[PDB]
């Protein structure tokens, strides 16, 4: 009758899973495990509360609801945007996590990978097809955990000082799921003493914030930050700006105008109403600059991520960090004048200067003219193809590449063993136009072994390539070293070595855009303060 | 009795010259022609008085005295420094000019080249061997004129507003000589409707200030700016700072016995021996290289606005200019104070010496500005490589002081109506005494433009003599026609294409951009930074 491999007991009660198929063999999956009390009604904006025990058997055979979030509609029906859109019904009752393990369940402790999805802290879900853990788990014999965490106002609205909207509760959802992993992953065969966090974009920034928050640091052992960093300009907000943004959302939804009374009014509004006004609280209208992000209030983050990175002892830490070849291109089609996936986006000088203020919001004009000085080729100041590439650089450098390089350089010089990569393979199945190169987010499907899905159109070399990346990631999870053949050297502040990841063997290079990132990380700070 | 070719009448009276031998035949030289009353005693610091007429024949047969100036002593006996030092006795009686003309005198009017020497406005002389006009005149049949002008405190100490030391008298010395050329160059066979100014370093800056001063602009028709521009950070000074430097010098020498009355102040200065003023000249500065004590002052009179204001406001139609730089403009200056530098070793500096050199080479900018300079000129993949640090500090110093000011001037003249030609001089002389690490240093194109290699007592090789003959032709072609050309072609410089030619033994090679990236930093961004 019942397959014993799919029955598991955890602290809160009993679970029933589902056997899944991969081209390499079966896999055990436990999907939609509740790890928190549903943050509904009076629990909205509040820190998560642990899930109370249940009787009977929770059905963990299918993904659970996606946390309430805005839906991308820029290209309705387009594969490249819909693949990130919610693929289950939206609900505030969304605090569930998923566990994939080998079949039969391992009987000795197995290394655990924990995935935190990105989405600008306003979107995402652990149920997206591209985050399917069945391939990594079968190919590399790890246990894979992913959780949903509250995004948008539901996870990061903050009235600093108040107990009714304290902020960062989306980060506390992540931590609670990390706590759940410590207490329960052993029942699945996982080793709670070998937990590697990994995440992309705002998920990579989340990982970094768990590295810089002592209550989280005891819940995992390694970290992987893909195309994201806690020191990114989009990843945190100050207390005063967070209060301004929260108050502005209240006014926009008909709410006064006392923290207690404003949150109370906010808790009466349907969730979709908060979503619908989310984008209209920002200071300037631009691509980027998400409304509700982690707040630096001296609690979860006792200081800014940049300050905590500079002051940190990181001996005993191994991290894997990296970027795609063209981090900036994907973001340009969301409001940089002249850009479109459906045309070559050959922009004009004036459109270029306009894109700079949109891609680097929040900076003085002297700062913006410093940007256009540095990214203008003064022998070809008006070439449209060069201006397209240069603004892609402006946007990718400022928001992804240079924060990652600053994290990597500081962690390495202060005790961590860091491995750095640049992902340079353009998927043969990629739907975005060729002028975008290798865009943001497009390494994920290879990390998760999606090319091994037989019902997809990846080439045979792309499958070999995916198996190489899964082996790198699992090797790092098992030992803190991706290497097993040309070798991947650690990244250091001086040599600045990284490897290119594509169909060719590893190629070692120097410098994560060192010249450009010297501008963002070393000069531009001094210009803004004085 | 007398050679008729060596006798000339000008407005003030009669002159007798000399017939000079050249490697290519005779030349008539009139050396040491007085063009102003000697600025002695009560006329110290005053504008030049035109020379009063004389009876009899004035012997213009040798170079006259060098205007009082400080004497370089960094490497005593070394040709690389002694070649710029005075080769005549120092005197305040020094306002004389020189005319070289073909022998026999031209029958039809001949275009004139007027040379203005450099020396940071504190040094120089028209009598330096490397300024000998006999080769240019012989090879290209032109009239060449060069003048002495007051330098240091004697030419540029300014108590602005006062009549006893209005400042810029060294520039007025140059203008008086230009006026002399208009009234008198025809008597030597020269064409006063074809006068081409050319000068180097502070001489080039001087040439530019005459472009931007309307009273001077009527006295010439074409300009050549070699390794200098009026808009360079070293070339001008504000009235308040000029008054401060003048007052500190006076104080350093006991005047007054603090400023007070300007007339009282200058009169005390005028009783000090010239050598005393020279000996205290460099103490008046806030130290570094480069910044010079007494330079032209922007005071609304000779310069109605700053040179960069005048350059942007300018309509330059009908003007032809030839501008350029040597290959390594900054290396020569570094051995005069940059820590770790010497002509006698490799000057392979440390990063801390690089950072300290930046403050010395870019003096009087904020720490934020200095940070921006270190960011731009640091290779962040090789931030401490001593050889790259050496070249980078040379680039900092040369771009800031020479290349980028000239590039700003070239692009604004071309955009606002002038025909512009641009060069980079890239031949390191076989006779060069400076070490190899300096490349082609500041000032070492001059000997080739003046045809100095044609001198048989010098050991230039034969291609270098051909090279010197090529450049003399380019320069004289420009003076004649406003275009140095006469296969391969030298295209004009434009704000867009930014084309220039390299000058070395090889044929002409066209290239784009006078360090366009680096100069965008100095000319476009850094001014915005310093206004915030
Ligand atoms: C290169 O030389 C400079 C200057 O030193 C002079 O030149 C040398 C070749 C030698 O002849 C010295 O006797 C001269 O004094 C060196 O910089 C100096 O270093 C000394 C300490 O040794 C210091 O007291 C001076 O202040 C420095 N002066 C300057 C201008 O920096 C430099 O260290 C030498 N670098 C080498 C050896 O490669
Ligand atoms: C500074 O001193 C000079 C010289 O004494 C003054 O100039 C003279 O002023 C007197 C009147 O006090 C006149 O009679 C003389 O003809 C002036 N001689 C000149 C012009 O040299 C000058 O007025 C004083 N200026 C001040 C007081 O600032
Ligand atoms: N304003 C928008 O429509 C919007 C919505 C979502 N995103 C980001 O979501 C896409 N995404 C989300 C998570 C991870 C990767 C990616 C994309 N990679 O190319 C951008 C703009
Ligand atoms: N003693 C000094 O500090 C000093 C420094 C520089 N100069 C300038 O004189 C040299 N010079 C004078 C005129 C033209 C060119 C050049 C240099 N070419 O490399 C004089 C004195
Ligand atoms: C693969 O390509 C075929 C067309 O050759 C198309 O019909 C199919 O939908 C594609 N499937 C995937 C997984 O993209």
- What CATH number is given to the structural domain containing A301? 3.40.50.1820
Q: ∠ CA A494-A496-A500 to the nearest 5 degrees?
A: 165
Give the resolution value in Å: 2.6
Give the residue from A421, A389, A416 showing the smallest Cα distance to A405.
A421
Q: Could you tell me the CA-to-CA distances from B264 to A422, A480, B160 in Å, in that order?
A: 74, 82, 15
Distance separating alpha carbons of residues A103 and A17, to the nearest angstrom = 11
Q: Does A7 touch chain B (CB under 8 A)?
A: no
Give the residue from A33, A175, A27, A34 showing the smallest Cα distance to A110.
A27
Any idea what DSSP says for residue B523? I
Contact present, A335 and A425 (Cβ < 8 Å): no
Q: Could you tell me the CA-to-CA distances from B154 to B70, B123, B149, B249, B276 in Å, in that order?
A: 12, 11, 10, 12, 12
β-bridge pairing B18-20 and A27-34: unpaired
Q: What is the 3-state secondary structure (H, E, C) of A55-112?
A: CCEEECECCCCECCCCCCCCCCCCHHHHCCCCCCCECCCCCEEEEEEECCCCCCCEEE
B42 burial (CB, 10 Å; 0-12 / 13-18 / 19+) is exposed
Distance separating alpha carbons of residues A174 and A296, to the nearest angstrom = 17
Q: ∠ CA B254-B267-B64 to the nearest 5 degrees?
A: 100
Contact present, A66 and A90 (Cβ < 8 Å): yes
Distance separating alpha carbons of residues B20 and B232, to the nearest angstrom = 38
Any idea what DSSP says for residue A8? E
Index of the ligand 5 atom closest to the CA of residue A79: 14
Q: Taking the mean position of all CA atoms in its chain, how far away is CA A375?
A: 27
Give the residue from B219, B179, B223, B225 showing the smallest Cα distance to B205.
B225
- DSSP codes, A123-162: ---TT-GGG-THHHHHHH--EEEEE----THHHH---TT-
Residues with CB under 6 A from ligand 2: B 261, 263-264
Residue range of the domain that includes B400:
1-532
Any idea what DSSP says for residue B120? T
Q: What is the 3-state secondary structure (H, E, C) of B336-357?
A: CCCCCCCCCCCCCCCHHHHHHH
- DSSP codes, B173-207: HHHHHHHHHHHHGGGGTEEEEEEEEEEETHHHHHH
- DSSP codes, A234-268: TS-B-HHHHHHHHHHHHHHTT----HHHHHHHHHH
Distance separating alpha carbons of residues B54 and B127, to the nearest angstrom = 24
| Residue entry with tokens 């303060």 | A529
Q: What is the 3-state secondary structure (H, E, C) of B227-243?
A: CCCCCCCCCCEEHHHHH
Q: Could you tell me the CA-to-CA distances from A476 to A199, A222, A315, A319, A320 in Å, in that order?
A: 14, 8, 17, 9, 8
Q: Taking the mean position of all CA atoms in its chain, how far away is CA A238?
A: 20
Distance separating alpha carbons of residues B260 and A16, to the nearest angstrom = 99
A199 is in an annotated binding site: no
Any idea what DSSP says for residue A221? S
Pairwise CB contact (< 8 Å): B372 & A523: yes
| Residues in chain B closer than 8 A to A522 (CB atoms) | 375
Distance separating alpha carbons of residues B204 and B228, to the nearest angstrom = 5
Interface test with B, best of A349, A373, A527 (most B CBs within 10 A): A373
β-sheet with A13-16: strand ranges across: A7-10, A13-16, A57-59
- The DSSP element (H or E) to which B226 belongs, if any, is strand B222-226
To test ligand 5's pocket by mutation, which of A450, A457, A462 has the most ligand atoms within 8 angstroms of CB? A457
Nearest to A518 among B375, B516, B529 (CB): B375
Pairwise CB contact (< 8 Å): B520 & A366: no
Distance separating alpha carbons of residues B41 and A84, to the nearest angstrom = 88
Structure obtained using: X-ray
Angle in degrees, 0-180, between the axes of helices B351-361 and B367-377, rounded to the nearest 10? 130
Distance separating alpha carbons of residues A174 and A216, to the nearest angstrom = 9
For the record, the structure tokens of A307 come out as: 């300050």
Chain B residue whose CA is closest to A509: B381
Atom 12 of ligand 4, residue of closest alpha carbon = B119
To test ligand 4's pocket by mutation, which of B82, B122, B201 has the most ligand atoms within 8 angstroms of CB? B201
| Residues in chain B closer than 8 A to A370 (CB atoms) | 525, 529
Distance separating alpha carbons of residues B455 and A38, to the nearest angstrom = 97
Q: ∠ CA A413-A415-A416 to the nearest 5 degrees?
A: 95
Size of interface A-B (CB pairs under 8 A): 46
Give the residue from A39, A248, A241 showing the smallest Cα distance to A154.
A39
Peptide bond into A182 cis (omega under 30): no
Q: Does residue A459's CB lie within 6 angstroms of at least one atom of ligand 5?
A: no
- Give the three-state DSSP class for A339: coil
Nearest to A379 among B379, B380, B516 (CB): B516
Contact present, A510 and A497 (Cβ < 8 Å): yes
β-bridge pairing A57-59 and A13-16: parallel
Other C-beta atoms lying within 10 Å of the C-beta of residue A486:
9
Which residues of B18-138 form beta strands (DSSP E)?
Answer: 18-20, 27-34, 57-59, 66-67, 90-91, 96-102, 110-116
Distance separating alpha carbons of residues B521 and A294, to the nearest angstrom = 37
β-bridge pairing B57-59 and B27-34: unpaired
- The DSSP element (H or E) to which B445 belongs, if any, is none
Pairwise CB contact (< 8 Å): A378 & B532: no
Other C-beta atoms lying within 10 Å of the C-beta of residue A231:
25
Please provide residue B334's backbone torsions phi and psi, each rounded to the nearest 5 degrees: -70, -30
Distance separating alpha carbons of residues A413 and A415, to the nearest angstrom = 6
Contact present, B154 and B171 (Cβ < 8 Å): no
Contacts of A192 (CB under 8 A, 6+ apart): A112, A181, A182, A183, A185, A186
Atom 3 of ligand 2, residue of closest alpha carbon = B263
Contacts of B130 (CB under 8 A, 6+ apart): B83, B446, B447, B450, B452
- The domain total for chain A is 1
Give the residue from A325, A453, A451 showing the smallest Cα distance to A389.
A325
Q: How many residues does chain B have?
A: 532
β-sheet with A318-324: strand ranges across: A18-20, A27-34, A96-102, A143-147, A110-116, A190-200, A222-226, A318-324, A417-423, A497-501, A507-510
Distance separating alpha carbons of residues A136 and A141, to the nearest angstrom = 7
Other C-beta atoms lying within 10 Å of the C-beta of residue B7:
14
Distance separating alpha carbons of residues B190 and B221, to the nearest angstrom = 14
- Give the three-state DSSP class for B217: helix
Q: Taking the mean position of all CA atoms in its chain, how far away is CA B19?
A: 28
Contact present, A77 and A13 (Cβ < 8 Å): no
Chain A residue whose CA is closest to B530: A366
Distance separating alpha carbons of residues B353 and B476, to the nearest angstrom = 44
Contact present, B428 and B440 (Cβ < 8 Å): yes
Pairwise CB contact (< 8 Å): B516 & A378: yes
Distance separating alpha carbons of residues B309 and A291, to the nearest angstrom = 45
To test ligand 1's pocket by mutation, which of B74, B334, B336, B340 has the most ligand atoms within 8 angstroms of CB? B340
Contact present, A71 and A110 (Cβ < 8 Å): no
Instruction: Work out the end-to-end distance of chain A between its first and last CA atoms, rounded to an integer number of angstroms.
Output: 73
Distance separating alpha carbons of residues A153 and A147, to the nearest angstrom = 18
Distance separating alpha carbons of residues A291 and A158, to the nearest angstrom = 11
Closest-approaching ligand to the CA atom of A152: 3
A68 burial (CB, 10 Å; 0-12 / 13-18 / 19+) is buried
B131 burial (CB, 10 Å; 0-12 / 13-18 / 19+) is buried
Q: Does A508 touch chain B (CB under 8 A)?
A: no
Q: Could you tell me the CA-to-CA distances from B194 to B143, B216, B317, B419 in Å, in that order?
A: 10, 15, 16, 16
Index of the ligand 3 atom closest to the CA of residue A81: 10
Distance separating alpha carbons of residues A163 and A264, to the nearest angstrom = 12
Q: Could you tell me the CA-to-CA distances from A529 to A364, A366, B260, B368, B532 in Å, in that order?
A: 11, 12, 42, 10, 12
Please provide residue B528's backbone torsions phi and psi, each rounded to the nearest 5 degrees: -60, -40
Beta bridge pairs of residue A34: A96
Q: Does B54 touch chain A (CB under 8 A)?
A: no
Instruction: Work out the end-to-end distance of chain B between its first and last CA atoms, rounded to an integer number of angstroms.
Output: 73
Contact present, A153 and A123 (Cβ < 8 Å): no
Other C-beta atoms lying within 10 Å of the C-beta of residue B11:
11
Other C-beta atoms lying within 10 Å of the C-beta of residue A464:
11
Distance separating alpha carbons of residues A134 and A143, to the nearest angstrom = 10
Q: Does residue B84's CB lie within 6 angstroms of at least one atom of ligand 4?
A: yes
How many C-alpha atoms does B319 have within 13 Å on its Cβ side?
Answer: 27
For the record, the structure tokens of B371 come out as: 């940070």
Beta bridge pairs of residue A144: A100, A113
Q: Does B513 touch chain A (CB under 8 A)?
A: yes
Long-range contacts, stretch A376-383, CB < 8 angstroms, 24+ apart: A376/B520, A377/B517, A378/B513, A378/B516, A378/B517, A378/B519, A378/B520, A379/B498, A379/B512, A379/B513, A379/B516, A379/B517, A381/A349, A382/A348, A382/A349
- Give the three-state DSSP class for B11: coil
For the record, the structure tokens of A172 come out as: 């506390």
Angle in degrees, 0-180, between the axes of helices A239-252 and A271-278, rounded to the nearest 10? 120
Ligand 2 centre and the CA of B491: distance in Å?
Answer: 59
Ligand 1 centre and the CA of B289: distance in Å?
Answer: 17
Q: Does A379 touch chain B (CB under 8 A)?
A: yes
Catalytic (active site) residue A398: no
Q: Taking the mean position of all CA atoms in its chain, how far away is CA A32?
A: 20
Torsion of CA B478, B480, B486, B492, to 10 degrees: 30
Q: Could you tell me the CA-to-CA distances from B511 to A299, A379, B366, B503 in Å, in that order?
A: 59, 11, 34, 11
Beta bridge pairs of residue A420: A321
Atom 26 of ligand 2, residue of closest alpha carbon = B261
Q: Taking the mean position of all CA atoms in its chain, how far away is CA A503?
A: 25
Beta bridge pairs of residue A8: A15
Distance separating alpha carbons of residues A63 and A42, to the nearest angstrom = 25
Contacts of A290 (CB under 8 A, 6+ apart): A120, A121, A122, A234, A282
Q: Does B505 touch chain A (CB under 8 A)?
A: no
Pairwise CB contact (< 8 Å): A523 & B375: yes
B131 is in an annotated binding site: yes
Q: Does residue A201's CB lie within 6 angstroms of at least one atom of ligand 3?
A: yes
Atom 11 of ligand 1, residue of closest alpha carbon = B344
B111: left (phi over 0), alpha (psi -120 to 50) or beta: beta
Distance separating alpha carbons of residues A3 and B452, to the nearest angstrom = 101
| Residue entry with tokens 């930050």 | A225
Distance separating alpha carbons of residues A391 and A375, to the nearest angstrom = 8
- The DSSP element (H or E) to which B170 belongs, if any, is helix B169-184
Number of helices and strands in chain A (H, E) = 19, 14
Q: How many residues does chain A have?
A: 530
């Amino acid at each position: 009758r019942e397959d014993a491999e799919l029955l598991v007991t955890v602290r809160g009660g009993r679970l029933r899973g589902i056997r899944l198929k991969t081209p390499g063999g079966p896999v055990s999956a436990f999907l939609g495990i509740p790890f928190a009390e549903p943050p509904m009604g009076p629990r909205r904006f509040l820190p998560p509360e642990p899930k109370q025990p249940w009787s009977g058997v929770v059905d963990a055979t299918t993904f659970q609801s996606v946390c309430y979030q805005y839906v991308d509609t820029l290209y309705p029906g387009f594969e490249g945007t819909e693949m990130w859109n919610p693929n289950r019904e939206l609900s505030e009752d969304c605090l569930y996590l998923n566990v994939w393990t080998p079949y039969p369940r391992p009987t000795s402790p197995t290394p655990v990978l924990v995935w935190i999805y990105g989405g600008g802290f306003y979107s995402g879900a652990s149920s997206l097809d591209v985050y399917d853990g069945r391939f990594l788990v079968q190919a590399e014999r790890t246990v894979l955990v992913s959780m949903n965490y509250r995004v948008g106002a539901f996870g990061f609205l903050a009235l600093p000082g108040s107990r009714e909207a304290p902020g960062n509760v989306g980060l506390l959802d992540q931590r609670l799921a990390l706590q759940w992993v410590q207490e329960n992953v052993a029942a699945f065969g996982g080793d709670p003493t070998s937990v590697t966090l990994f995440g992309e974009s705002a998920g990579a920034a989340s990982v970094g914030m768990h590295l810089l928050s002592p209550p989280s640091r005891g819940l995992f052992h390694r970290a992987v930050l893909q195309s994201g960093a806690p020191n990114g300009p989009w990843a945190t907000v100050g207390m005063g700006e967070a209060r301004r943004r929260a108050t502005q959302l209240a006014h926009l939804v008909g709410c006064p105008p006392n923290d207690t009374e404003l949150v109370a009014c906010l808790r009466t509004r349907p969730a979709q109403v908060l979503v619908n006004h989310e984008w209209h609280v920002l200071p300037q209208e631009s691509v980027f600059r998400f409304s509700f992000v982690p707040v630096v209030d001296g609690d979860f983050l006792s200081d800014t991520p940049e300050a905590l990175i500079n002051a940190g002892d990181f001996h005993g830490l191994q991290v894997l960090v990296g970027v795609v070849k063209d981090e900036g291109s994907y973001f340009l089609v969301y409001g940089a004048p002249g850009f479109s996936k459906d045309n070559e986006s050959l922009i004009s000088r004036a459109e270029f200067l306009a894109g700079v203020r949109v891609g680097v919001p929040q900076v003085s004009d002297l700062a913006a003219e410093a940007v256009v000085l540095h990214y203008t080729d003064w022998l070809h100041p008006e070439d449209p193809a060069r201006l397209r590439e240069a603004l892609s650089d402006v946007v990718g450098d400022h928001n992804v590449v240079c924060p990652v390089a600053q994290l990597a350089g500081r962690l390495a010089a202060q005790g961590a063993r860091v491995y750095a990569y640049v992902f340079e393979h353009r998927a043969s199945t990629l739907s975005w136009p060729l002028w975008m190169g290798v865009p943001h987010g497009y390494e994920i499907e290879f990390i998760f072994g999606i090319p091994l899905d037989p019902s997809r159109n990846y080439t045979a070399e792309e499958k070999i390539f995916a198996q190489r990346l899964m082996r790198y990631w699992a090797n790092f999870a098992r030992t803190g070293d991706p290497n097993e053949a040309p070798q991947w050297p650690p990244y250091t502040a001086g040599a600045q070595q990284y490897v290119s990841l594509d169909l060719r063997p590893l190629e070692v290079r120097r410098g994560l855009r060192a010249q450009a990132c010297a501008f963002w990380n070393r000069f531009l700070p001094k210009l803004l303060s004085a």
